[PDB]
Each structure stands twice: as structure tokens, then as C-alpha cells.
Amino acid sequence: STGSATTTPIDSLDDAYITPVQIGTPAQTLNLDFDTGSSDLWVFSSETTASEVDGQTIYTPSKSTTAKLLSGATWSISYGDGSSSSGDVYTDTVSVGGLTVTGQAVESAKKVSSSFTEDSTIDGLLGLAFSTLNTVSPTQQKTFFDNAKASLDSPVFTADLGYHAPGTYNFGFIDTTAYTGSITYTAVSTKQGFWEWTSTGYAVGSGTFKSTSIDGIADTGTTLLYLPATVVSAYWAQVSGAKSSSSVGGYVFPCSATLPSFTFGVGSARIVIPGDYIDFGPISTGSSSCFGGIQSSAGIGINIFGDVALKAAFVVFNGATTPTLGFASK
């Protein structure tokens, strides 16, 4: 089998992307944030504290003839941005772009933190990291991809995120019309549960490529590109007036600037992020200070190839027995 679904930016900055997902019988369609950095499929629901729902579409398990309470199971997750959610668990039928999994764990939120409430466009998350990170207790549950894998034509999914435009998540096949040149595959460590790989270096604008190993994760659920402070300083030093602002929480730059591109290495191949992809707009409405899309990872503990980097590429998440990642230009 295969599946193919369009993913759409939630706002004019590409802060996140939502993908429609069918849950239950009859189908209830919710718009989920596909997150290769986590491993829980959780939804706003009829069980979510009413004051914490503000415009999201909710899953109502009592209206699904295929929903079954997973008795005793609870979940609770905290994300790198400080947000969190928790609740109980149902199994139900879940379909993405025509690919159907029966018996998928659907984690129903009883509580969500303010950032989720305040984002009316995201109805939940669909985790695509490794199932070892799934938070359901006492019986850990599998991701949608893990449950689908055996049925797929090939044990892969691909992320093709757009810049200020829709893109595609495919399951079970590689669309050879969706990229240019060849796909370069690179090794993955699953020891931390992530799609963790090692970039071979970077360049800033038209500058020379610096060969240096940068370990990080391919994370569709993180907006920006988080890299070591040395790399990030070298980037912003090429933008007149750019500075790191403790009060804003990162590098800012004059909105009048033209940003240089940023290149990252995948083996001997190179992915070029155009400068415009690194502009996240005014820090507050009407400000002439703009927020940068490349930020230091020094306070995170891990480097994160988030959407800013991934949207410049066609990305293969290869879930074969030994997983690997593939990157192509597009």
C-alpha cells in the first residue's frame, strides 16, 4: 500500500504545517502537525478541558463505531518548546492520504498547555520519530508509520515541505518526479529515538564550505534550524546589524536586510537554503527588527534540522531494518 497527503503551512511564516488525517468511523478529519521529532499521535478531543479548546476540531470517540478505550493507558508529553499535553488513549482506524491503519493508538488530550490552545489551526500531533519515544503507559504504543510499515510497498515515508506553499507527505514510495538530481543517503542513529544523523559541514552565502561534523535530528515539528553557536555566529556575522538579543530570545536582524543563503552538507552532497527561507518577519507587529531562522542550539542539548532546513530538500525517512535518511535538492 501507499499514502499521499498534502501538508499546508499554518500561517504566512511557515511556523508549522498541517496535514488532514481521518480518524474513526465515520471519518472525523483533523488537521495534525506531522512531527518527526516525537512519537505520539494525540488529538484535541471531546475529553479536552473545555477552557483549553479555542477553535480546534475535536475527535469524539463516542461517535466512532471503531473506537475502543485502551483500558488503563495514559500519556503525558513535554516538548522542547516547553509545551505539553496529556490524557487517555483509544484505539481506532486512522487514515492518511488513502493509507489506513486499524488499531492505531489515538491519544485523547484531557489537558493541553496554553500554546496549543492558542493555536486554533493545529488539532493535534502525529509523531513520526521512533516508537521507543512513545509516552503511553503502562504499555508503550507504536507510531502510525510503525504500524503501517509492513503493509507499505517500501518501508519509507518522505517529507516535501513547501516554502510559503503546500507540500506533500508520502508513505510507502519515493516520488522520483519530486526532486532534482539524486538522493544522497546518510547513516542514522536511533539511540535517542530520533532521526539523528551527521551533517558534513556548512557554507554561508557564496563562502567556502567548512568541513565539520554536525550531529543533529531531522525534525519536521521544529520550525527553525538550530546549530552550534560557532556556526550560527558565522552566519549572522554576514548580515549588517544582526545581533543576538537576550530579550527577544535569539538572533534578530534589520528587516531591510537581504539574507545570504546557508548550505549544509549531506555526505558529499550539498543542500542550499535560500536566504529568504531564514526570514521569520518582525519580532512584533510593525517592528523593523526581524527574527532569524537560524538560531543557536547551545541551550537545547542537540542540533535540530527543523523546517527551515528540511523545506529546502526532498527528505526520505527510510525505516528499513537499518534506518537511513536521504536528502535531494528540488
Where in the sequence numbering do the catalytic residues fall? 35, 199
Query: Which stretches of 116-207 are assigned E, i.e. beta strand?
Result: 124-127, 156-160, 167-171, 184-187, 196-204
The residues with which 264 forms a beta bridge, in sequence order, are: 202, 271
Q: What number of other Cβ atoms are within 10 A of residue 139's Cβ? A: 11
Q: Is 143 helix (H, G, I), strand (E, B) or coil?
A: coil
Q: How many Å separate Cα 181 from the centre of its chain?
A: 24
Question: What is the distance between the alpha carbons of residues 103 and 77, in angstroms, rounded to a whole number?
Answer: 21
Query: Which among 169, 149, 147 has a CA at the least distance from the CA of 158?
Result: 169
Pairing state between β 289-292 and 250-254? antiparallel
Cβ atoms of residues 259 and 275 within 8 Å: yes
Question: CA 199 to CA 214: how far, in whole Å?
Answer: 5
From CA 153, how far away is CA 150, in angstroms rounded? 8
As a whole number of Å, the CA-based R_g of the chain is 20
Distance CA 259, CA 290 (A): 11
Q: Are 268 and 200 in contact (CB under 8 A)?
A: yes
Question: Phi and psi of 122, rounded to 5°?
Answer: -110, 115
Closest CA to 158 of 305, 326, 10: 326
